[PDB]
Design a protein around this ligand. Sequence first.
Ligand SMILES: Nc1ncnc2c1ncn2[C@@H]1O[C@H](COP(=O)(O)OP(=O)(O)OP(=O)(O)O)[C@@H](O)[C@H]1O
Ligand SMILES: Nc1ncnc2c1ncn2[C@@H]1O[C@H](COP(=O)(O)OP(=O)(O)OP(=O)(O)O)[C@@H](O)[C@H]1O
Ligand SMILES: Nc1ncnc2c1ncn2[C@@H]1O[C@H](COP(=O)(O)OP(=O)(O)OP(=O)(O)O)[C@@H](O)[C@H]1O
Ligand SMILES: [Mg+2]
Ligand SMILES: [Mg+2]
Ligand SMILES: [Mg+2]
Lengths: 48, 106, 101, 304, 289, 242, 284, 246, 263
Amino acid sequence: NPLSIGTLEEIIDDDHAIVTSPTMPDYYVSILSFVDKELLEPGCSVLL
Amino acid sequence: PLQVARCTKIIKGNGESDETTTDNNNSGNSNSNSNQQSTDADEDDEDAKYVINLKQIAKFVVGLGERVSPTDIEEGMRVGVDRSKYNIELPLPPRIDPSVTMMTVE
Amino acid sequence: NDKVRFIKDELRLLQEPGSYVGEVIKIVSDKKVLVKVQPEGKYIVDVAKDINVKDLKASQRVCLRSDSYMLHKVLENKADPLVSLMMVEKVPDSTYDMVGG
Amino acid sequence: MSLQHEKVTIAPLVLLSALDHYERTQTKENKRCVGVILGDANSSTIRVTNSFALPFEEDEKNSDVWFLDHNYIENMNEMCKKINAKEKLIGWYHSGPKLRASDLKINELFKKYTQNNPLLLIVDVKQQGVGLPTDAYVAIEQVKDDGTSTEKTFLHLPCTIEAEEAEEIGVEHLLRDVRDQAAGGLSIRLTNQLKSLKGLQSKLKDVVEYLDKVINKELPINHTILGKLQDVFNLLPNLGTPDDDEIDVENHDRINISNNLQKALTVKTNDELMVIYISNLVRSIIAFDDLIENKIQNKKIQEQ
Amino acid sequence: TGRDDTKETVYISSIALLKMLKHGRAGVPMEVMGLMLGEFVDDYTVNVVDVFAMPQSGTGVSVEAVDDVFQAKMMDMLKQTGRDQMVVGWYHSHPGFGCWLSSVDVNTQKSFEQLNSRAVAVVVDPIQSVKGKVVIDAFRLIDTGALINNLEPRQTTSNTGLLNKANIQALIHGLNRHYYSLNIDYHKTAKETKMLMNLHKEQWQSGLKMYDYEEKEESNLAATKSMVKIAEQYSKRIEEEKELTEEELKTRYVGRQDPKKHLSETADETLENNIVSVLTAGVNSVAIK
Amino acid sequence: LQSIGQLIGEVMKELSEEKYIVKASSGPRYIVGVRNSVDRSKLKKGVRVTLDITTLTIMRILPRETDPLVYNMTSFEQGEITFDGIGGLTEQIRELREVIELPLKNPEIFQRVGIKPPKGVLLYGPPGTGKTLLAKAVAATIGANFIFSPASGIVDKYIGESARIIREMFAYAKEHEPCIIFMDEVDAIGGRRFSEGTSADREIQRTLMELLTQMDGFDNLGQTKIIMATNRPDTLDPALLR
Amino acid sequence: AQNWAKFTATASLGVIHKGNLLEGKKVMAPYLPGSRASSRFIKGGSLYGLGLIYAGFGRDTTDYLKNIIVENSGTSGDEDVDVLLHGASLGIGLAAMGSANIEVYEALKEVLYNDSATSGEAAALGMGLCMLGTGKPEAIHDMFTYSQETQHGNITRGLAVGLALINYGRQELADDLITKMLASDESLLRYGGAFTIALAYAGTGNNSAVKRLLHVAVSDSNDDVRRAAVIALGFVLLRDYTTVPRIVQLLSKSHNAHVRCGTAFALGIACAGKGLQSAIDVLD
Amino acid sequence: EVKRIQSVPLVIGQFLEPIDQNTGIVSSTTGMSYVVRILSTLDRELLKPSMSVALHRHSNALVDILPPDSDSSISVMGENEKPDVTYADVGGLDMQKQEIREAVELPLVQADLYEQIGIDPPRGVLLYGPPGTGKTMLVKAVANSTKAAFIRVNGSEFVHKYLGEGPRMVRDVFRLARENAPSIIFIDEVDSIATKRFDAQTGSDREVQRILIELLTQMDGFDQSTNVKVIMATNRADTLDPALLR
Amino acid sequence: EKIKNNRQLPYLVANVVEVMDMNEIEDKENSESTTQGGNVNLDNTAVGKAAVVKTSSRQTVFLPMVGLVDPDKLKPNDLVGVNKDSYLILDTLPSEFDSRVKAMEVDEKPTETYSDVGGLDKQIEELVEAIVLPMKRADKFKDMGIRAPKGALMYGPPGTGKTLLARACAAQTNATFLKLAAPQLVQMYIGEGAKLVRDAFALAKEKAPTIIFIDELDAIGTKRFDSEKSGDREVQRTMLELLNQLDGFSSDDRVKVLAATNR
Ligand SMILES: Nc1ncnc2c1ncn2[C@@H]1O[C@H](COP(=O)(O)OP(=O)(O)OP(=O)(O)O)[C@@H](O)[C@H]1O
Ligand SMILES: Nc1ncnc2c1ncn2[C@@H]1O[C@H](COP(=O)(O)OP(=O)(O)OP(=O)(O)O)[C@@H](O)[C@H]1O
Ligand SMILES: Nc1ncnc2c1ncn2[C@@H]1O[C@H](COP(=O)(O)OP(=O)(O)OP(=O)(O)O)[C@@H](O)[C@H]1O
Ligand SMILES: [Mg+2]
Ligand SMILES: [Mg+2]
Ligand SMILES: [Mg+2]
């Protein structure tokens, strides 16, 4: 807790993504656990 | 995670004046920090260095990781740097100026 | 005794970690609520057992204590930005006693 | 060198450091501990921020033989630069309980370290004195005007404290005294009032007996000391002058403010007297009602 | 059984506590650190006698910033003066952050924890010492195997203890998955006490010493002038005090902060002050001449 | 290394002789203390000070601090060409001197006359006529403190930051008086009122208004002289023409 | 359970098997060393447990336990040795309670000088159980001074209250000791100081004793010191418990926690015998 | 204990609004809104009305009150100098000067006379027209002769160069005027605040837009006080919003 | 060994606001023009010489300048490295730019010679007079004592091989070939577009002589700077900035502008 909401710029399909939070920092995340590559599509709001 | 940065200027690490410690100009040609001392006349500081600008808007001088070489890293190219201490881990696809462009591919 | 020993409890309170003013954009019914901390980011975050997610509703201004980011109590006094809008518009007070003929 | 000398500001960490290094050499039975004094100087106020031990031996049979290791001090100073490189050698602590005239000879050695006239700080380890338990001196070379040659001598420098902001919250943190040698409330200031007067009594007594010694035991006359005591007389107050009558008139003024204030406090209290008296008048109704009510309750509790 | 540990409370001597503060304020914003020289006795008392400061790095606090080479050299210097004993851990200073060990500080600590199992890590906050209380806390690694067997309860038994907090957030997370925090008592002897207490040469030079009578005329003039204003609010106020509910009266006719209490305080402060002002005045006239 | 960096502010408002309000350069306004190792009478408004980062107490007073953009403008003073080198337009030099060079040299004879010493020259004409050359010719010969400032190069990406640059530019010309401030190619921030377009047109307005009150109003100027070089003055707000 | 939690289990058995003295040895047999050896807590917790069975009746048993203490006191041992040595020392205290033998005084003295961490605590207590009320001046003088020598905190705690136990029932003859214990700058010496007044003037509502305990409770900033003074009141005012709720209303008014902890305990002791309705009402 | 927390170091907030009387909501000068404890032995009657305030450094608690005189945009000139010009140095526009001694000078001193006729008080004063016209010259003049506090801003002294800087200025000038009334607020030019249209599709607008809206709110409150309502000047005649002229 | 810890990566980036200066008198106080009050000190208010830096974390910091960097290598507007967690100046760095600016840089464009630009012999000879020969026969500008031309315009109808000649004959002679585009200069962020003209001329001045070939010229080739209710005040702003950086300002003679246009 908490669940830091970022906004998804784009995924690279290999189990990583580039997100840009509203709190401002960009982070090189992993697509991993209780999430899929089909559920992630630009402009979506993702849970970190 | 990795803090996403983006390189702003390759400033090569020899000829950066990254040795001032040796204050002697009687030794060396003194055109570069590896030519500050002429005993070796060669590496006394990293070969290549980089200035990045984070996306928190703070610039730092970062150098070479152990799995990237300068063939891999270029000016204007997004990089990922370690979140706690900044140093290029992995190069990423060009710019953050892209956004509508990812729409346009159909 | 009443004056000196009230103060010692009060030292704990002043020495808080800080606490923020968010508003719930929308509820999740796993007892988490999407709360936009208003100058800061959006966070989906659990609540206390003092409040339930059916007492919170969109457009509920809430307090949330950043040590877990967990909601304490609702703001008992809300103010609408719609008040700020009505002020600009302006209604002159008048009945049918300011006309005639 | 520098001739700028005024006060010695001394940090509390300095005081504690020399008690500790004395107790972990376990030097006693009049055996000494002399260490380095570190801090800022070339400055009017000499500012002693820290201190560290130096290996030191003092012979008690014959006092004219001592050990100082010159090699250690340089090494040790280098490691001080690790900590904080604003520190250089500005003198030495002595472990007390008092000044010695063998300190004159020790002093020579530390002139090849310093950029200032070296500091002598007595840290009294038994903590004796009615104020601070440190005297502070500095070595001076001077001609003597009583017709004798140039002496090397230790002239007094006043002691005061200033400390870092950070250090200052720690000192208070360990401590839990309410203080009776610093001023607080009315009662506290009466205790300090009496302490000051008895302090004066103690020092003044010592002056009379000092005068007695010169002309009956034969301490050498020293013009420099007795010269301040003359000025005690010329700056001395007088009685029945138009200054000492302003002094009475000012008492009459202040006494009147105190009168209004005592009386203001009496207003406030006679109102608090009436208020609680209303509280009692109110509580009377409740009391009456309670008795009729308790009748009903007694019987029920016995039934169950 | 294996070997079974219980609570400890870390006793930070007067000398050490100031030293940590001195070093931490000076090197900030940069993280400063240093080794703890001490001795370990009992099963409940970690005695930290002294600290010293290790040279800082721009690479912060880490495994490679401690410097064991400078340690070996420092150790001999303490050796010749009788001020060596045996090294009981390390300290470092975070600035605006709480007391807690960062990921890099876990790995620093783990190396200390092998060498001596009774190694503590002591976090100093110097940007949070601006309060009248200095926030300082100590930690000690609990082994990875131990957590699976849930042996954090094992450390809590055998006293009620203080179980004091002064910080949470990040601290409690790190506690679950790594370490056990230790409560702090401070040691001092009856010599150290007097030094601490004495902070004045104004122990006997503060009752006969005084401020000019100009300044006493200012206090007298300010004090009398203001008490009129508190007295005019109290007069508006007590036109009431006869309606329903105290709490209402206080809002509407401004009973807030109690003007009755506020006048008593302002009178008490100047009243006690003038008795002193006269008391010292007359004392000087009569004793000195 | 061991003498760590301290954060700089400026005193907003004396509250007391022990408590001063500063606005830092990190952003926050504080009530800060004073260390009793510096003055307490040279803390007055507008005064640059550094304060501690680890108890936020004023360490010391400092002289004023002036932007690197206004330092760039001063480090442009080059062009060694004399008033000789202006051929043809030598008449224009006598005329230029009335307003600028005679009250600059001695304002004492203009007091006898009884008018306010004037300041301001507009150079306007169809381009390539050496209005810039004229600026470099009077920069050469008198040899005062000059500020050669491009007037579209003093605006940047960030907001409110174009008010800070020019304010401290007048601060510079008051200190180093007599000083002439060359505003060269002033047509972008000299523009009409606008403000029914983009947010850019409102950025010109906020900077333009800072310039107006700083020159004439309830702050006047007095030994600073403006040379405005514009190409066309039909691009211009009537406030600045006036 | 493991550690001291397992310790607790083995010494709880001898609260249950209290009385039935003949079968006390039997039921404790396979937990006694020499038939238990799995864990050091079990082997010691049978000695602690065995003493509890024989409390106040334990004159024969005292001899039996004594061999184990002399055995492990030519060593300071390892910490395994300490846990065993720890439960032997509490055990002989309980067995020999009120005996006044010198043999037991002397035996535990060799434990105390080992300076064992947990056994030093149990020895210090044990001297006080055995020698309850005697007033031997040699016993008083050695313990007090040793308290300052020791550097383990548990041992000081144990010593401080055990002095109280030895100066039991002696009233105004214990008065000289009371004054040194209070005069100290060590909290433990004050923590034990309160208890010396409590046990010597125990059950007699001597006004001088209650005054010290009151003054000290309030007037010291040290947490142990405060706590201890409050608990002491109940012992003194055991006979005249009529006066206890009205005296201690004061301490429960105050919002310091250590004070408040001890205030409850003072009502616990004082009105233990028979409830007083007021006592309950103040504790709610 | 509590007196060291009262003293420095302290960050300046502003009290936005209450939600309790021992808990309040402040926006600090870090560009964050904090919910804070409110220490006792402080105001409750200028505390709760919007006014500048001191909060402790890292704790985030309201530990001290900060007068409505301090942290102001500018100070009164009723206890400093006024610009030393008189209306006898104004030559022309005596015709326009009649209507403005009517606005300022005549209800300041003779408030009783307006209530006696039953005519409404005068309100805000607009000076508009091309910049040749001498608008400023008269304001300077009348400020000396009317014997009242004179205040002062320009709309680039309401410069936002930190976030939430700019609306704080609006609250400063007006609260201060009320306090030492009779008083006059001068806003020297308002062509940046007075923009007929706005975007508000980027951050740089919205700070100015909030200034304008707050400006309107405090002039409406300002009525029926013995202050003269805001003197203000403009350049063009269609800077004005139908909202700033109403 | 201490210095090398600090020197090691990472480290923060600041520019030098100004060099304030402070006396080397540490034996009482600083009195350049600002006397110091109260207490006298070695080095708590009586410090040595001073550097003011502006960080990129949005602040300014007042430090005693480092004793290893000289006061000749500190001058206003230098970019210097600074310690990441303190703020002491370790070293000096070459001024950085944007990544838009690093795009402008050479890729080693190959030559394609003037002979593969068929026909149009007279125009090539005129264009060669303009760019090539003031560099080469710089012996002749020094003899004759004329001033250098600051650019040559190439205009005409589209599709006459302007672009190709320029690319080919600039790559032929050897000089810095900058890649700059007119439509680029107008950007959506206010007053950043102006800044980018200043960084292009900067890059030309480090590497001078440089030829700056501007692709297109009609983005900034705006006949308006008298406008009405538009975002056009941003467009014409970077035209005026072009004129300020073609304004003489020293070491600009060497640096030229080629430019192709269709209108
Ligand atoms: N009066 C003159 N005497 C001699 N040379 C002149 C004269 N006028 C102009 N020149 C020459 O022309 C050059 C260009 O003039 P400059 O750019 O200064 O003009 P301007 O009228 O401000 O135009 P713009 O600002 O639109 O470029 C000078 O450097 C000089 O060589
Ligand atoms: N009536 C007058 N008598 C004397 N001087 C006057 C008169 N009118 C105008 N002036 C003078 O004209 C000059 C400029 O006029 P002023 O400063 O009042 O500008 P303004 O009309 O407010 O311009 P803006 O639109 O920029 O606000 C001043 O020096 C002022 O003294
Ligand atoms: N004279 C020529 N010789 C060879 N090829 C040519 C010639 N003219 C045009 N071309 C061809 O046409 C292309 C387009 O012309 P280029 O871009 O060089 O010039 P331009 O006149 O600036 O036109 P625009 O800017 O409209 O494209 C050339 O790159 C080349 O392939
Ligand atoms: Mg020009
Ligand atoms: Mg005007
Ligand atoms: Mg082309």
